[PDB]
């Protein structure tokens with residue numbers, strides 16, 4: 001009785017223009033499409049429409065090792081005679097009729113629907129599952145997919161793949177669904193035990209391969225297995241202390257789809273980190289006001305620096321990066337020469353001695369803290385190159401703010417890793433996340449509660465444009481980037497704690 | 499009709515003396531001895547010898563919610579309690595004759611035999627499984643256990659507990675034994691897994707809950723999933739970059755059992771980080787030579803310090819902890835007063851502002867590296883207290899030598915945590931391990947793997963002696979400790995890549 005439907009698709013439901021597919025041969029999909037419809041472990045049926053049949057290459061088009069059926073009225077038998085095992089290709093008046101052709105039951109064990117209108121037909125019971133490549137890079141189409149919701153901003157999600165990429169296209173794969181020895185030793189497992197938790201992320205999606213879940217389940221654990229603590233601000237925290245998330249970069253770039261990340265500013269801050277700016281005023285008016293609230297006249301006073309020109313973060317972050325150990329004067333002082341340029345070495349090292357185990361970047365100088373707007377959240381990282389000339393990053397963070405900053409802070413260093421990857425002449429492998437007191441604020445509860453009701457969407461690609469004018473990490477300029485096929489959910493307003 | 503035994507013994511197989519039990523009430527065992535023997539998710543039987551019966555206080559004697567059978571010819575008639583009143587008591591002649599009580603077979607699911615004399619005749623033919631509370635201390639005994647091979651230096655494992663403890667007694671729990679749609683989901687998992695000799699720590703131990711496994715498994719993955727690299731020394735490693743481990747402290751200290759830890763030096767070294775000495779000729783002189791290797795005349799001349807007194811580690815770990823950023827003169831130089839006393843701030847904060855997120859200890863001072871014998875491995879740590887006045891630690895190691903140093907490293911910063919927990923007046927919970935490039939030298943390939951065969955033994959518990967006289971971190975003296983119930987296998991010995 002039951003059937004399945006293979007579809008690749010632009011997020012707005014496009015499938016095929018001028019009789020074809022609009023994306024350049026994406027190959028990790030062609031794997032997927034093959035090794036689904038071909039398998040019963042170690043033949044199946046593939047039922048397409050007349051025009052679906054046409055969009056195929058002549059040598060390819062007897063779809064191999066599975067029976068084909070074509071819902072057509074004009075053609076029938078001019079098809080073959082066009083030349084082992086390979087089944088005589090059939091033509092069935094309609095799709096309910098394709099099903100009737102069952103003379104065939106037992107001789108096939110899975111039927112797979114590879115056409116628009118034919119798709120509408122399938123919906124008008126039949127199926128149960130819908131194998132769907134989520135393509136995120138949009139293209140123009142004419143033939144669009146029919147009416148379950150998300151993909152853009154019932155058949156329930158049961159699988160999310162981890163986002164891949166070929167020839168400029170980010171896309172993940174999804175699955176929609178219609179809606180003694182061993183035991184003798186449980187007596188003891190029984191008592192050391194406590195079991196279900198049950199404020200968890202996305203339950204009905206069983207296979208959870210989209211890397212973002214680390215984060216979403218990092219939320220759950222926090223409220224589930226965290227403790228309700230005081231902190232500086234006056235706004236209640238729920239903390240675990242010490243977690244971890246590592247992400248793939250070698251395909252798609254890890255910008256949180258769950259809610260519109262603030263890209264813009266994580267880029268603008270990195271530069272500001274690459275530059276060595278300590279004047280947060282240089283940020284503010286470029287539209288990035290995240291640090292505006294940590295240097296206010298009213299705040300530097302409550303940080304015991306009455307001696308600071310509102311904005312000055314002092315020897316904070318990147319200052320410690322490029323000028324370590326120096327006597328910092330003011331956010332107008334040209335510091336070019338003073339202090340260790342940690343960051344200078346990392347790249348010098350990486351391009352000559354990649355096997356070194358001294359590729360770090362410490363923003364924690366104890367002989368400072370009471371001079372900065374605030375002592376550093378993300379305080380240290382490390383770089384590494386293995387067999388495949390692939391760069392990889394670890395960053396260590398004292399205080400991670402999951403509702404708000406983490407999302408941000410995530411890209412920041414992933415983005416950076418790309419930065420470093422390129423300058424050193426490499427292809428970027430993995431960023432990883434090591435966190436101190438890991439917590440969420442109390443007014444972040446209800447809002448995060450709701451973010452948990454969102455499916456992760458395929459990650460974007462982030463490109464370095466102008467790779468050939470870029471030779472060093474400064475040659476990077478707020479323009480040399482392309483945030484592609486990024487398909488976010490809606491932003492969630494979560495208040496910052498001063 | 500095979501069965502299970504309820505043991506609770508010392509490493510040499512000692513079980514009871516002068517008719518009692520030789521260890522002070524151990525409660526986490528008593529529960530364990532309760533829950534096991536009456537179960538199979540919706541009674542059982544407990545069979546014992548005459549004196550094994552006279553052990554119990556009469557209030558305990560009727561072992562409630564189970565069947566009690568006592569093989570003995572002397573005792574025939576009793577009553578000490580004699581209501582529901584389900585229990586029913588029964589006396590026997592011999593064990594094979596208690597078995598011969600199957601009436602009963604329906605009324606009871608499994609029988610458990612709880613001592614000596616009856617233990618040795620239960621083997622000498624039925625049985626199958628052995629519920630054994632490995633007790634890590636020895637005590638004076640007379641009534642021992644029969645003929646063991648894994649209490650000290652068939653019945654194969656399956657399950658290892660995680661070392662608990664009551665009243666100064668560490669002990670593991672172990673088990674020995676005789677010798678609807680997701681079908682849709684499969685097609686895709688299939689191909690993704692498609693690369694798929696993998697060696698593995700004790701695979702005949704299914705439940706692996708001891709904790710040391712993290713490390714043993716840490717080995718497996720390293721050779722299994724790591725890269726063949728050239729490193730500084732010219733030895734060659736297999737490395738993964740980015741691993742972790744976090745160990746239970748509030749019951750037992752995580753001193754490694756698979757191979758004898760070189761405890762002795764670990765204690766001394768930390769104190770020598772607590773003292774901050776740089777002259778390794780002090781260390782050498784108490785019989786610890788792990789560091790005398792990287793401070794030879796030839797090594798500092800290979801570190802282009804022609805001006806360093808064979809030993810002087812430079813402004814290394816300890817120096818960076820107690821006197822930060824300060825001009826370092828020599829390994830004799832009294833520096834008392836210079837720089838930042840990172841550590842002193844930590845306790846200071848912890849006794850006052852525990853909810854702080856500024857309780858750290860950085861030894862990565864990049865304005866130093868060119869001076870020291872080596873740039874710091876265990877570079878950063880962090881202190882945290884939840885609302886349960888419990889401490890916790892993260893340390894961050896840039897580089898890790900799994901074979902030799904890691905075990906060593908493990909104790910150090912655990913041992914530390916205990917100190918910090920006691921001095922701040924707290925009860926320690928957990929240490930956590932964050933490692934960068936994590937690698938095993940290629941000449942450790944074989945030694946390790948032979949370590950892989952060894953069972954973890956229950957962890958030891960470590961005590962601070964002279965808790966009263968100890969008021970600050972300095973008040974610690976190389977003798978204010980005892981290692982209790984540590985039962986390692988022999989040390990393997992793995993060369994150090996100079």
Ligand SMILES: NC(=O)C1=CN([C@@H]2O[C@H](COP(=O)(O)OP(=O)(O)OC[C@H]3O[C@@H](n4cnc5c(N)ncnc54)[C@H](OP(=O)(O)O)[C@@H]3O)[C@@H](O)[C@H]2O)C=CC1
Pocket residue numbers: 006007008009015016017018019020021048049050051052053055071072073074075093094095114115116117118119121143
């Ligand atoms: N990205 C992806 O996953 C996919 C990409 N594509 C693309 O889509 C485009 C073509 O799709 P589409 O225009 O919808 O063409 P179809 O493959 O759906 O074929 C249409 C024709 O098939 C017959 N047919 C289809 N449905 C019915 C029906 N319900 N009842 C009776 N006959 C039916 C008719 O044939 P007749 O006129 O002879 O009577 C009809 O003209 C191409 O550009 C193609 O490459 C195609 C498949 C999937």
Ligand SMILES: NC(=O)C1=CN([C@@H]2O[C@H](COP(=O)(O)OP(=O)(O)OC[C@H]3O[C@@H](n4cnc5c(N)ncnc54)[C@H](OP(=O)(O)O)[C@@H]3O)[C@@H](O)[C@H]2O)C=CC1
Pocket residue numbers: 504505506507513514515516517518519546547548549550551553569570571572573591592593612613614615616617619641
């Ligand atoms: N740590 C633990 O897990 C355990 C602790 N213990 C301790 O062990 C000690 C007592 O053990 P143990 O000395 O060995 O005494 P037992 O419990 O084995 O009892 C011995 C008596 O039971 C009868 N009996 C036992 N075995 C046989 C046999 N094979 N054939 C015929 N009769 C048999 C005889 O009784 P009779 O003379 O009347 O004919 C015999 O004298 C105590 O100190 C007790 O507390 C006891 C249980 C387990």
Ligand SMILES: C#CCN(Cc1ccc2[nH]c(N)nc(=O)c2c1)c1ccc(C(=O)N[C@@H](CCC(=O)O)C(=O)O)cc1
Pocket residue numbers: 260261262288289290291294401404405406408409491492496497498
């Ligand atoms: C991490 C980091 C760097 N930082 C610095 C920074 C400084 C103090 C902090 N304080 C606290 N308590 N939490 C933080 O996350 C935090 C972050 C950030 C600061 C703000 C936003 C932020 O407000 N994001 C919002 C709105 C931004 C916008 O659109 O203008 C959002 O879109 O969700 C992001 C990053």
Ligand SMILES: C#CCN(Cc1ccc2[nH]c(N)nc(=O)c2c1)c1ccc(C(=O)N[C@@H](CCC(=O)O)C(=O)O)cc1
Pocket residue numbers: 759760787788789792899902903904906907989991992994995996
């Ligand atoms: C980590 C750390 C601190 N250190 C410092 C230290 C310095 C340089 C290093 N270099 C390398 N390549 N690996 C290390 O583990 C290492 C460790 C240690 C050094 C040696 C031993 C060691 O030799 N342990 C042996 C034998 C000791 C003995 O004689 O008893 C053992 O018993 O296993 C342990 C710790």
Ligand SMILES: Nc1nc(=O)c2nc(CNc3ccc(C(=O)N[C@@H](CCC(=O)O)C(=O)O)cc3)cnc2[nH]1
Pocket residue numbers: 006007008021029030031033034055056057060063064114132133
């Ligand atoms: N996910 C998905 N991706 C697609 O490309 C796709 N294409 C169609 C129709 N278009 C085409 C065009 C060419 C081939 C094709 O040549 N198929 C080969 C793949 C070669 C390989 O094994 O890599 C095949 O034999 O299956 C298939 C479908 C229908 N559903 C789809 N569904």
Ligand SMILES: Nc1nc(=O)c2nc(CNc3ccc(C(=O)N[C@@H](CCC(=O)O)C(=O)O)cc3)cnc2[nH]1
Pocket residue numbers: 504505506527528529531532553554555558561562612629630631
């Ligand atoms: N693992 C193990 N631990 C033991 O202490 C033990 N003891 C015996 C015999 N000694 C004793 C002495 C007293 C009680 C007793 O009072 N039993 C109570 C436990 C109380 C509780 O539930 O906490 C019982 O009702 O089972 C049991 C065994 C046999 N096998 C053992 N096996």
Ligand SMILES: O=c1ccn([C@H]2C[C@H](O)[C@@H](COP(=O)(O)O)O2)c(=O)[nH]1
Pocket residue numbers: 232233374375377378399400401402405406409855
């Ligand atoms: O890059 C950053 C910078 C700041 N914070 C958040 C984490 C803490 O919740 C908050 C307050 O800083 P402290 O009170 O921990 O200094 O800032 C981040 O998460 N990431």
Ligand SMILES: O=c1ccn([C@H]2C[C@H](O)[C@@H](COP(=O)(O)O)O2)c(=O)[nH]1
Pocket residue numbers: 357730872873875876897898899900903904907
């Ligand atoms: O506390 C320590 C000190 C040293 N090492 C080992 C790790 C490296 O294998 C080795 C060499 O140091 P670098 O070449 O990475 O500096 O020392 C540790 O694992 N832990």
